[PDB]
RNA sequence: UAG
RNA sequence: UAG
């Protein structure tokens, strides 16, 4: 439980922060849609080991900040 | 009991901080509702691995500040 | 007994710090009530997994420094 | 016994630090007085999971200084 | 679930950030297509020991930022 | 064998450094007895959860540079 | 999963990053060919204990940064 | 064998780093006497929990210089 | 296998890194040799506590710079 | 093998760098005698909890620097 | 595996980089010989606690840089 | 002010 | 001042 995290602040409405799966499979397990101005902050966790952002948004991580664009 | 944590201050009334389901599945399991003003301190936890905040708060964490705006 | 805590400093009388319980479920178990210049100093524990302040304080913690409003 | 720990020195008499439970029940277990000018430094323990400063006191913790005030 | 990640994030349309597996064996496991502006936050895995980058992509990781061109 | 420690010098004679037991009781299990410059360096331990100190003294932990007076 | 890793960006066509075997011998086990703006984040892991790398290339370590020259 | 440990320069000859017992007893268990000039760099252990330094000397720890005076 | 490493850089044709063994005896068991502008980044390894350079080359660790010189 | 060491570098011949045992017992187990100039490296170990430096001498350690004197 | 290290560059021909035993004796185990300009990166480890550095050299250690002399 |  |  005490794994890294990422802060995603939405920039537009409709940004996705997609979680990818795990293990020797990478594929889609849960899509977060956020709208503009919404924060999540999500570890990385048994299920998580990528984690990709479509859409404007501000990102904050361990390694500093950059946005991602639509 | 050591996770991290993150620190949610409500600029607002009605400011919502949910927590979000660790595992397989991810949904909600609890959502706090914060007035302007109030302060929320909160861990990562068992059942939490993702925290979505919807509108006006302050938001400290280990990575920065930040504000969210939504709604 | 290492984890981590928050200093609490009440600019008021009552002043609440509010102890949310760790688990699958999230309600009450404590709140402590400050008059207007006593200190509190709180870890998260078993029992603790998230602190609420209502009232007028100034808090401390490892990420920086942040007063709560009435 | 490497958990974190708190700087207290008395600013008046008659100072009480306060060693809440640790657990399901928050109580005190503990009140030690201090006078003008004495220092406790005090841990946080399997006993004692919140700490509480009463009367004018100057607190030093690994997230920096503070001053308690009295009535 | 702790282990370092890298950034990414995609410069023009169709970057891969290829994962090859951990083990006796060097081979693709996964290659992850990325549009401009989208952000990839991976982690080093059971299965992924090192990551290449094919195309223009900006790069965060704990020893600096790059940029690849390929 | 490697917990926190403090330092203490006295400024005076007769500085108590006292140790406070360990434990669901709070009572004193020892206090040494200072004269003026002598220098005592005293660890946290199984037995010693809080330490006071009486009389002036010049301490120093982790968290900085404190006088006790008396 | 958690070892320290290494980020080469290749600065001309044909750059090698070579992976020699852990253990009492010393052998190659993989060659990565990597093509000018190409980058390769890679773990030093359990077959893996040296990286050598041939051709022009920049290098970022917890070390700090180097190029390799062909 | 990784704890803490004290540097003392005797200032004057006849110094004495006392170590104080760990456990629910405290008394001395050495008394190591230094001439002026001599450096005795000394860790907390399974024995010593406290460490008193008599006459004058020039100290470092970890949490900064002091001289005791005698 | 997260123990630490060196980055050594070729100044001339035949550099040599030697491992030498871990262990009560101290031989060589590897000279990895490097022609100019050649990287090697070496770890220590349960084979491999010391490690020598013979001729022009820059060395990077965790301590600094240094070059040796043929 | 990982504890704490010192460095020693003798400012004149004769310096006896002095290894007093751990445990119950605190008397010499070993005395390194250096002549002008020559450096030792010496750990704190299952054997050795303090370390006594006679004669003139630098020292450096984890808490800063200083000098013996004969 | 991951213990500290030192860095040791010969400044003359003969320089010895002398291995102690772990342990109650302390003997030599090598004397590993440098020539001028030769490096010499050696870990603490099961056999070595301590390490005597005979001729001029120059050293780096976590603790700083210092020059042995004959 | 005990060792 | 031994290895
Ligand atoms: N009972 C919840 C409390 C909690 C902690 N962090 C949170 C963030 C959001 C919502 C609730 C929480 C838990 O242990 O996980
Ligand atoms: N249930 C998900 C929640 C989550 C954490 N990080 C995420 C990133 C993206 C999407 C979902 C998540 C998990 O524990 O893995
Ligand atoms: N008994 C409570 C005491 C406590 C610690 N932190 C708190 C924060 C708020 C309220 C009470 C507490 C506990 O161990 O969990
Ligand atoms: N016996 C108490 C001593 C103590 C430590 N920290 C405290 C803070 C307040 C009051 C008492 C204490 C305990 O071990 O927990
Ligand atoms: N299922 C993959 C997801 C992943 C993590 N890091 C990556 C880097 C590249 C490609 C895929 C990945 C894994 O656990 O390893
Ligand atoms: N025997 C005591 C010695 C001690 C350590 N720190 C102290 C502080 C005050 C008084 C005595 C001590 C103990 O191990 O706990
Ligand atoms: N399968 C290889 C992949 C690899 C990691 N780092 C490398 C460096 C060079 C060449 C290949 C690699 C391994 O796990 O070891
Ligand atoms: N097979 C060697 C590879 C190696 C690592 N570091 C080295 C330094 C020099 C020479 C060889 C090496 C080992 O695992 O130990
Ligand atoms: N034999 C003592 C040596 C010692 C270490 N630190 C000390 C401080 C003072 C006096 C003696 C010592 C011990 O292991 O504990
Ligand atoms: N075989 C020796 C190699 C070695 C490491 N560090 C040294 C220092 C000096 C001489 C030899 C060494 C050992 O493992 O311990
Ligand atoms: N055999 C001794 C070697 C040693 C290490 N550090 C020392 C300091 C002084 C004298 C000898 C030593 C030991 O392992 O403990």
Redesign the interface.
């Given at each position: 439980?005490?794994?890294?995290?990422?802060?995603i602040?939405?920039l537009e409405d409709g940004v996705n922060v997609i979680?990818?799966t795990?293990?020797?499979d990478?594929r889609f397990?849960?899509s977060?849609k956020?709208?503009?101005?919404?924060?999540?902050?999500?570890?990385?966790?048994?299920?998580?080991?990528?984690?990709?952002?479509?859409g404007?948004?501000?990102?904050?991580?361990?390694?500093?900040?950059?946005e991602?664009?639509?």
């Open positions: 439980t005490n794994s890294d995290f990422v802060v602040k939405a979680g990818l795990r293990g020797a990478t397990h849960h977060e956020l709208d503009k101005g919404e924060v999540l902050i999500a570890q990385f966790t048994e299920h998580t080991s990528a984690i990709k952002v479509r404007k948004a501000y990102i904050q991580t361990r390694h500093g900040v950059i991602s664009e639509g």
